[PDB]
Design a protein around this motif. Structure first.
Motif: not given
Lengths: 194, 160
Positions: A6, A9, A67-68, A98, A162, A182, A185-186, A189, B5, B8-10, B12, B17, B20-21, B135, B138
RNA sequence: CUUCUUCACGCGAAAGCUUGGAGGUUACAGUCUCAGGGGGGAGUACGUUCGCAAGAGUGAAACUUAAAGAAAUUGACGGA
RNA sequence: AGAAACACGGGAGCGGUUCCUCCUCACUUUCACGCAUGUCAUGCAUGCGAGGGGGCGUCCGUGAAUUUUACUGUGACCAAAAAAGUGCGACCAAAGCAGUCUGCCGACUUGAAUUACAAAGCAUGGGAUAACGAAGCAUCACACCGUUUCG
RNA sequence: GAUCUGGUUGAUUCUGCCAGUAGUCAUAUGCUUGUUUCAAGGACUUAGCCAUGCAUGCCUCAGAAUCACUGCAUUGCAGGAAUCUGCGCAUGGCUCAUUACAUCAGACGUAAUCUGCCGCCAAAAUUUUGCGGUCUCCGCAUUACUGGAUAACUUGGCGAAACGCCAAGCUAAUACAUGAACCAAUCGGACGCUCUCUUUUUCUAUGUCGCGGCUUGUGUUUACGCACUUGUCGUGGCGAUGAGACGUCCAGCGAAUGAAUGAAAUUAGAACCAACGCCUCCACCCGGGGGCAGUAACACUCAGACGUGUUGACUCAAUUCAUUCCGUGCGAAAGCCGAGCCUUUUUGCUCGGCGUCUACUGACGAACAACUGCCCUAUCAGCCAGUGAUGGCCGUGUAGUGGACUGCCAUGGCGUUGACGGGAGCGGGGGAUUAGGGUUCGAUUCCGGAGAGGGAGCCUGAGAAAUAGCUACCACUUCUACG
RNA sequence: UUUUCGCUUCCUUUUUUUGGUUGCGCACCUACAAAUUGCCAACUCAGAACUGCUUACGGCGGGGAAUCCAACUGUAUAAUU
C-alpha cells in the motif's frame, strides 16, 4: 520486482509517502500469467519459502462438476463463452476464476444415463443391461427434475460452466456447470450484445 | 435484488448451491428462505435483515465473507458519500501531562459496512477490525448503535 | 454622568489608582481575548499580501550595543 | 449492569427444602467383566441395598431463545527492556549476592524489594463530563394491571 | 544546595537587561601532576579514502579401500593426503548515511499468512527379486534383492596473468537412481452375465423367504428357443418377492476441484392413510391365519441403539461420494557401534541401541496490520483523482490480506485539533540537569529500527536484495609479457 | 365524512332547502412494474485488438531574449517612402 505495498501510494491527505529502505523481496510478486486454452505447460514454481504454485500455460480438460448432481465427470473444456470482464478476454481464452466455459457433456450425459438410465440423443451404455438396472431408474423416478436446457446443452455436448479455482494462480480450472437464474441471466446477457 | 441480483453480476457464496428438495409451504405466505447469516463473531447476533434480507455483498462479513476479530472501536459516522463503506470520526481529548489539560483531537476511519445496515454521518457505530478489506479498510462496521432501541420514540409524539 | 466630597484598607515604585479605580492577588487562580516580552538594528528589508492611490496589512535576520527606560527626591538652572 | 422471560444439558443436586409406606439392607431387561472390606491371595464370603414416588421454595452448566440497560474521575487490581536510580557490611570506597563450614571429606543458606503521558480491563463511586431529554402533540387528541371468556 | 552578587543615579526609589555564578564528568585544549584503586575512549568534519595485516567452519564410535602418504615388525582399529556426504554460514562487528505517523514505544492484529531448525509424533500396496520357463508372458518360487555417473587420483595440456583454464583416462558415498516388499486393518464406490437361506446344543445365537411366468404385433443361422410388456396372469403385482449371498470391477492412505455434512427454541390433541417395529393359533423349521405398538400386554435367551469436532468468533478442522493431480503413497535395494546364535567365526539366522527417511502439529521465527503516541515551521494550506486519489464492483496477483493489481463502476477521500509543503537528527530504553514546577539530551555500549561503495536488479535457500554472494549500470581502483 | 363536487331515492327539519341516505358521475396511479419488449436508426467520438513501416498527396505559425520608437485598430504620399 513488484512490491505488494500500500505504501508508495498517496497517504490520503494526499500526503506524500516516501522511502525508508528496501523494495522488500518478501513482498515481491509476479506479473500476470494466466494460461491460454490449449495444451498445458504448467510449471510448479518454487514459491514463497519454497513450495510449489502452479503456473499454467494453456490447459485443456476439466472436471465439470455437476453442482446439482454431485458427481463430476472429467471432460473437454470445450470452450470459453464468457469472461465477465471482457470480450478480449473471452476472445483470448485466457482462463480465470469464474471463467465461463462450454463443456462436452457426454460423460455427464452418460452419467445420467448410467445412473438413472437416461439420455437425449445417444445410447452407448444403455444397451449393456427383472433388473438391477431396474433400480437406476427407480431411483431417478423417485424424483429428479433436470433442466431441459441443460439436456439440450448435452445434445450438442456443449454445456455452460463456471470455474471453481484460480487458474492464474493454480494453473487449473474446473468448474461446475453454470446455473439457473444466473444462467438465464447469462443467457440473456449472452444474447444481449449482438 | 433488482428482481434479484442488482449489480452487474451475482456472486457465489460460501453457501448457495441449492438444497432443491424441501418445498415448505409459504407459512403466512412467508417461507422465507435459507440464507447465510450466522452467529456473529466473539459474541452477538446479526440483523433479521441479513437472514431475511436478500442483498448480497462480499465485503460484508456478516452475511458474508470477511472476519472480524480484535479491537472493536466505536465511532461517529462521519462520511457515507462513498458506497457501502463508511468512514467514522473519533474525536477524543488528548491530555497534556505538563499542562494538565486536554486538547481536542480526532482521527477518521474507513470501515466497510455490510449492506444490511443503513447509517448516516453522525450515527454512532461500533466497528471491528478484520484482515484488510480495502486499502483503507481493515475494519468493518458492526452495529450502528442507538438509545432505548428507538432513540426517543415516546417523548416525540408530535402535533397535527 | 458624574463631578467629587470623601473613604476604603487596597493596590502601587511612585506618580498615583473607583461605579462595580490600576482595589478586593506571589495568601499568587471568576471567563473570554488581544498584546507584550533588554536596548539598538527596523517595523525594515523587491519579504509578502490588500489597496485606484497614498500606503495599509502582514513583518525579518544580518549588523550593533550596556543600557534604554520609569517615578519621585534633592539640587541646578530658566529667553520661567 | 442484573434482572424479568423462554429454552436446553449436568440437579433427593452443586447446595437446599417439602408430601408420600419414603419406612422394605439388591439398583439392571441385559452390557453394567467396577468399587469397598478381609482372608484364602482374586479359592471362599459379604454387600452395593430406604432404591422409588409425591413436592419443591430451589441449584449448577448452558443455549439457539423473549424483553430491557452512558461517561469520567477516583479505587483497586489487572497486565512489562538493559537502570545510576529502589535491596545482604563486598575490608572498604566505587560493590555484592553471597554466603553461614571446621563447627562441616559436611551443614544451614541464598538472595528482599522497585516505579511513568499513554494500556485496555475490572470495582466503586458521582463529584463532574457527552449521549438524549431536542423540540410537549399521538397521551385526552406511557397505553395498563390484568382476570374470567366457556364468546 | 529551592539565595545570588556585579553592573544605569546628584542622590533617591524604581522597570529592566548584560557580567558573574552553580553544573554538564558533555568535546577541545592549556597548564600541572606522588602513588595507587576504579575508566569511557576517530560518532562528531567527510557513510572521506584506504596499502596493510587479519577477522566461519567443523565431523563422531556412528555416509564413502583406494593402495598417495602415514601409522605399525606386520597386522594394524587408527590415520589420512585428500575429496564426494551435512549444516551453518543471512546473529557478528561497524555505523546512523537514511527518517519522520514513516518508524520507534505502549498496545495490538495476524480466522489476512509463510515458517529450515525442535519438541511434542504419526503411518497399508506392493510389482520389485529371483527362479523357471515362456508370451518378452505365464508359471514357479523358502524370495532374501537392485540400478546408473561423478570427487579426490593419473596423464597429457593450456595460459602472462588472474578467482585464468582445458582435455581425456580412474573408482564411493545416507549425493544421484529404482526408491525395492511378493506378508497382514477395521474401510467406500460401481456391475452382474452370478449363487439364492451362514456355524451348534439339550432349550436356546443372528444376519431370514429369493420366490416369477405366459405373452400382442415385433426379434435367432429364413420352420426349435428366451424376451418386450401392449395385453394377461404368478408370491400383491396388467410387465422384478430383490433384501441375502457369491463373484467381478474401480485404493478406501497425501494434495486438489466439486458436492454434502456444522444448536439443546411451542407442543403437536390425536386421528387417517402409507412404514417399520412388536406380540398372537400351530409346526424343529419352513409354513400357517390373527392382533397390536394411541383408552390395552406379560413370555422361547422375544414393542422404540452404540452418534452434539474445534474459538464468544470460521467458508475452520474433520469425514463420505463424485471428479482429479508432475510434492507422500517416508512405508527401506544405503552407513555405525553393541551383542546373540548358527557358522569356526564367517555366509546364514537372532537380538540391541543409532543413520538416509514423509505428512501434522508445536515451538520458533518471519513475514504481514491498527488503535494509541511521536520533533521544527503558514510572508507552508488547502491536499488529494493522467490513475490509483476514496470508495464500489469480477478476477488477477501474492505466502496470504488488501487498488497490491487489472478490468468495470461510483465520485471520493484529507485538511484551521493545520492538512499539504517545507524544517530539523533515526526512534525508544534511556541520558542529562531543575526544592518543586521544570529545561535539555538522547552518536554510542539498552532495545528496536535503520543502513551498508553509489545505484538497481536477480538467483538460491527455511531464510536474505542478503555488503569478507551474483548481475549490470555510476563513480573509483589493481594487474597485464597490456589478450 | 362541521366545506360551494353534482344529482337520484329515502330519512330528518316546514322543506319537494340543507343535512344525513342511496345509486351513479365529479376531484384524487390510490390503476402505479419494467417500461420489459418491438422496430428501426446514426456516424461521431472513444476503446481495443490484429498488423507493418513510411520527413512522403495536400494543404502546414520558427522561436527565444532585450534596447529605441508609436498606446491600440484605423489613415496614407496614384507611380521611390
Amino acid at each position: 520486482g513488484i512490491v505488494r505495498s500500500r505504501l508508495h501510494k498517496r497517504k490520503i491527505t494526499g500526503g506524500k509517502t516516501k522511502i525508508h529502505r528496501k523494495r522488500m523481496k518478501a513482498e515481491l510478486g509476479r506479473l500476470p500469467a494466466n494460461t491460454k486454452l490449449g495444451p498445458r505447460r504448467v510449471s510448479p514454481v518454487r514459491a514463497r519459502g519454497g513450495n510449489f504454485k502452479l503456473r499454467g500455460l494453456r490447459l485443456d480438460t476439466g472436471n465439470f462438476a455437476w453442482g446439482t448432481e454431485a458427481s463430476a465427470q472429467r471432460a473437454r473444456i470445450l470452450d470459453v463463452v464468457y469472461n465477465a470482464t471482457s470480450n478480449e478476454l473471452v476472445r483470448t481464452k485466457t482462463l480465470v476464476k469464474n471463467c465461463i466455459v462450454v463443456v462436452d457433456a457426454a460423460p455427464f450425459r452418460l452419467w445420467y444415463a448410467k445412473h438413472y438410465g437416461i439420455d437425449l440423443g445417444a445410447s452407448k451404455s444403455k444397451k449393456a443391461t427383472s433388473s438391477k438396472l431396474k433400480r437406476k431408474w427407480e431411483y431417478r423416478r423417485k424424483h429428479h427434475k433436470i433442466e431441459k436446457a441443460l439436456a439440450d446443452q448435452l445434445r450438442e455436448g456443449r454445456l455452460l460452466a463456471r470455474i471453481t479455482s484460480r487458474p492464474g494462480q493454480t494453473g487449473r480450472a474446473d468448474g461446475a456447470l453454470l446455473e439457473g437464474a444466473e444462467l438465464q441471466f447469462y443467457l440473456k446477457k449472452l444474447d444481449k450484445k449482438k | 435484488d433488482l428482481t434479484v441480483q442488482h449489480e452487474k453480476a451475482y456472486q457465489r457464496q460460501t453457501a448457495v448451491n441449492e438444497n432443491i428438495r424441501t418445498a415448505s409451504k409459504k407459512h403466512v405466505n412467508r417461507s422465507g428462505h435459507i440464507r447465510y447469516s450466522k452467529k456473529i463473531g466473539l459474541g452477538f447476533a446479526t440483523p433479521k435483515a441479513a437472514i431475511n434480507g436478500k442483498y448480497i455483498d462480499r465485503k460484508c462479513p456478516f452475511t458474508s465473507n470477511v472476519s472480524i476479530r480484535g479491537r472493536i472501536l466505536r465511532g461517529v459516522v462521519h462520511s457515507t458519500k462513498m458506497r457501502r463503506s463508511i468512514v467514522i470520526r473519533r474525536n477524543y481529548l488528548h491530555f497534556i501531562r505538563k499542562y494538565q489539560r486536554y486538547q481536542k483531537r480526532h482521527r477518521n476511519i474507513t470501515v466497510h459496512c455490510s449492506p444490511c445496515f443503513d447509517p448516516k454521518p453522525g450515527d454512532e457505530v461500533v466497528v471491528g477490525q478484520c484482515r484488510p478489506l480495502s486499502k483503507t479498510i481493515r475494519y468493518n462496521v458492526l452495529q450502528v448503535v442507538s438509545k432505548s432501541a428507538a432513540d426517543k420514540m415516546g417523548k416525540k409524539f408530535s402535533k397535527n
